[PDB]
Subunit: 718 residues, 2 copies
Amino acid sequence: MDYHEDDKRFRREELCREAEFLKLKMPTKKVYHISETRGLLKTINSVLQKITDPIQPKVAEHRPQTTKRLSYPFSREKQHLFDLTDRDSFFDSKTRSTIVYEILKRTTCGITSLLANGVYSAAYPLHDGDYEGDNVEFNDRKLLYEEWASYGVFYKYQPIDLVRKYFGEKVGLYFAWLGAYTQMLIPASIVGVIVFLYGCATVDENIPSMEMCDQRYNITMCPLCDKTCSYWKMSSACATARASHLFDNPATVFFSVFMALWAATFMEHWKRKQMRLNYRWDLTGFEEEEEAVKDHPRAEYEARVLEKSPAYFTNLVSIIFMIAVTFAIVLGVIIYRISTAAALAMNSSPSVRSNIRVTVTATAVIINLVVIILLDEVYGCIARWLTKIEVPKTEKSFEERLTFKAFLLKFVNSYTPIFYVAFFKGRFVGRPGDYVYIFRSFRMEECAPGGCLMELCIQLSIIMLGKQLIQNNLFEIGIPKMKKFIRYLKRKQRYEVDFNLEPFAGLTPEYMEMIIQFGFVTLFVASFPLAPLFALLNNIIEIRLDAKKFVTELRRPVAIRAKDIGIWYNILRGVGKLAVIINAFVISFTSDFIPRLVYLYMYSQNGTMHGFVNHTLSSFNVSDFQNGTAPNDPLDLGYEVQICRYKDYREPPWSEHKYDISKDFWAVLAARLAFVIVFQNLVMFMSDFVDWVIPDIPKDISQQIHKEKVLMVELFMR
Amino acid sequence: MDYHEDDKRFRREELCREAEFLKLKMPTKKVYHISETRGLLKTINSVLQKITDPIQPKVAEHRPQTTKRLSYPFSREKQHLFDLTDRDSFFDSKTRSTIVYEILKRTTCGITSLLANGVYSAAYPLHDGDYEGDNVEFNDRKLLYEEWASYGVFYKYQPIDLVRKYFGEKVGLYFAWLGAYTQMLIPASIVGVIVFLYGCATVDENIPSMEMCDQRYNITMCPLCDKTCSYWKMSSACATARASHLFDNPATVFFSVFMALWAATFMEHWKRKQMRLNYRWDLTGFEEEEEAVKDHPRAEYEARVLEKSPAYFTNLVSIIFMIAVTFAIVLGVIIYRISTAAALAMNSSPSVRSNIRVTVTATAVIINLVVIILLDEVYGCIARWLTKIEVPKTEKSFEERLTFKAFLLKFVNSYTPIFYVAFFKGRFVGRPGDYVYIFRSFRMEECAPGGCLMELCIQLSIIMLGKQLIQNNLFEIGIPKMKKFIRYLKRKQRYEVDFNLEPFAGLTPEYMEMIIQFGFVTLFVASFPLAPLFALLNNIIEIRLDAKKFVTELRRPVAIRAKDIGIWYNILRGVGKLAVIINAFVISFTSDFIPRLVYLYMYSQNGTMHGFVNHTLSSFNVSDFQNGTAPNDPLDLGYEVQICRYKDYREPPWSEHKYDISKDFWAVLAARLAFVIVFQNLVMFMSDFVDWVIPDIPKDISQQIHKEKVLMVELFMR
Ligand SMILES: [Ca+2]
Ligand SMILES: [Ca+2]
Ligand SMILES: [Ca+2]
Ligand SMILES: [Ca+2]
């Protein structure tokens, strides 16, 4: 318990004499406006500040803001600038802290470099009362914990009009965004499960999967290794083909079109929603540009320029940034190589002959993810330092610029193994005659038995479950408690309670996870349905986890008022527009959908497909290995062996040309590229069409603000 | 000579008794505001109106508009709403006519259905003085004719600040737009001529043109006709190949990229320019929506609804519109067919044996253009009537909706023969074995000897010269003089002079020609450079022709104030965005650029190309015609004949497969589609990049309006 103030202060009680020389000069400028009283307690002393009344409408009339009025037509109170209330207890704690903070920034000798220098350690508003606790006189924060930030309440709606009142429009605007995103994930998950279960129903009705699961063919493939791998039968790995038909179903194409159109209609819905939320709170968006002070090393450098009394260096460090992006790109694939090459050629030295091929893939991906989790912090640090070097003008430019430079890095290292698996996996190996030897010592890399699509789906699967759901939430809960143990192992007053809390670190690491997750929703659902489902399961946990992090474990933000999410809308629209071309390439060049359609329409010799797998397998002759690249010990799976088969669209060896590129390769390639053109153009046009149709401003808000303006006129004239 | 009034009136002097019963009830409502006097002269009587002073600041204060002030910092006078002048002769004639016209619309019993009923025939402001003439006391219109609307002055700049003062911001804004477009055409024409002359320099240095112009091959082609055409030699038509290399030069690809980027930078330049023109005239764009009265059959239908006291029918008539678009599309190709089939199989009955093949093409295109010129008016009329049926709410909705429905029609019938020539010409004929017989009586259509690109370039050429430059300007001058002869063959006072002038008919037919011409600039310069040149030559003539049409042959517009061109910006951005994909298809599928690159990189057997024309020609055997489709009288050009050649990428007849589709067809097709993907994506990204880079608001205007706002504050507080 105490009396009723606004903003605290945290000095460091015992150079030092200049610390006290500035520590008693600033508040002398603070005497004229705000009545301060300093308190002396156990650990480190603090400074207290209570606002005085008659300067508060000086600041409330200094800036234009809307406050509640007395008149109400149609069951709803109007708002104008500042008049007609007269309560002396109607200024909420949030707005009081806003005004007091404006005085905290305005007067100079603000707290930018005064706080950033070392004399002051923390400047922050306090909260009313306490969550849970005992015998509390109806706290707002207790109410908010009891209705919003509990795991037991995840079905009831977001109380957005209260969280705006207690945290401000920025923090309120975030949870509104996450609410609309999770609400839009419901039909995505329903349609995802319907398409996947349509996949599950008709697995054993198709032709091309039966052709592999059939016995009595005795068809043999080439060993896919340099020295030590043997011949393998087609019907051996047939579960992977069964799951392949579970994933590259002809309903998934329709699901991809549905997802592009889904992302577009989500953009429309959210524009409309923040428009009505800009109605309900603050309508005149004309904040005065160049309002705050400049960034202090720009004033320092500017002072150096005035001592001396650059359009080369910003572009120079932008090129530095692009360099870092390029070797980030190659670094991801480097680390993926190291990961798949964690345990190579271990067939011999244990001599147990497991041949399980599971631990190499599983621990490859898991070790890979450990290196990505470890490296992400480094990239964040390079973003902060580089943006510090560039010397932006304001705080807004620092926030925006740092946001973009962090996003490119996390995009690159968080997505590049999936680009390597989905596209560039088994493209570049030659015929079984000659192999493409990278580094001139051994082979590049070979695909899975039965298609590289499985490695994409299980890699993508354990990223949607590994890093997103379990790892990130477990550290997101786990870190602040451990910082609490660190800060401990080295009747209580209010600010002494709030000092033990952790300081607040912006909204960028909390939007960031959601932009990357949105990238997982829209960029790779051409080859993997039911991804939204995983996004929804992560999302329900994320909203309440973040809410409990606000109410429980953090001190209060200072309630910066803004009217849109900002740069994140451009990032969402960019990613959602990039999704179309990458879905076209995933469908055509990966999904094995084009060769089946071409075989149905050009080499059928009947109505349907049969002998498709007979058609793809390019017969080879085992006499033509390059003196050592033969299988080292042939398995003798049957009596003998004469010819191995492989899938590359090449002519048989007995023809007058052997081991060249056939007609069918160019036919399939032409059909693939034609699909890319048609898909990209039609889906760009549809995704534009649902922008042109849906009204970007809502009607009810336009007519209601028009009626409010008219009634404001006819009420004002009297 | 007369006294000084604002707005005229034209009644029809002798049902009739109701005409006079309303003719003396409206002006009784006009007595209260504006002092009218009626005059009685020779032909038909008129009514005169002079404004009275003290109601003019009632209307000038009724609406907010900016007028000149007394203070001037930095050599330029400020503007605010209405004060501080006090001249009683400072209201220009344009603004006086604006206010008087607002009273003409406001009071009701406005002149919408009062003028549209039949009692009033014309309501219009008059002009001061007269152009040229004799002894005129420094007319504004004489000045404007002497500086702007004369053919002798086409090099000196547009006097935009005077034409705005005399005609208003709409008509001024148009000539600003045409000024910026013609100014942007200068480097387009320079680079066009440089690329074309680079084509002209190195004609006789290449390989594939020499291969056709070479003698001593004795290579013979198949006759390309059903019954009566003979074998023709390759070296016969070699001028057409010479011009083909003049057009599909590898510099034209660079010119196509340059044109897409040119269109984008033109958009940026014009956004910036109308922004500063919105600075110089009127800055607060907040015109009150729903300001004027509704459209009178919507009030009539609304009255019928109120007698009765539809979201199906508007969409029904939209589908009607789409139907009209579809048979417009097929109608263009129908009329093109009739045109090329004007004189078919005339080799026999004259028996002169000219074999000139010129008159069929030339008169085909000319007859085609006559039908398009004749049909365009019909499509315009269907646009007006259909838009009349749809019953829009306002005048603005009628203007916009009619604009769009006119544009789709003129787009379709004005472009469809060029789509037929550039794309679908010789694609769909089979091998010389079997032909694709449309209508089951005779062959479809065959390409030119030496490529269908020539027919595209000469058709496109005589549209850029035929319909654009000569036909349209000749009728645009020719029509109003003939209407003057018609109106004649059935000391003078001012309104009696202005009555002989022709009424003004909006800006839509004058923007329309320029949007279609812009379509000719950006949509087909992949296969035809130096098109801008023709656009520039048309454009210089067009600006002065239109200007002389405003000053000389038309009565005055009523000066509607607007702040942008409107729908035409969306139409320009749409066409300029459609240009990229159509340039990709013109380069790949028409320009014969891909097969030369593929032959250079895959079948070279050396460094360079030689025997390219040897490679393309698919040898055929003349024994395999279908019993009558043989050449009827073989020409006996040599001793005998055994095999004819043709260009379709098919295997020779002596192989184990004959007359099927070879490997090389799929190879070339795959390369073509790959070029479409790469070109479309990279040019979309560049055309976006020059939007992201260039600041869409100018800096000087932003800082200058900020300084104007600050100085307005510190001048207002005193
Ligand atoms: Ca998380
Ligand atoms: Ca989180
Ligand atoms: Ca013209
Ligand atoms: Ca014209």
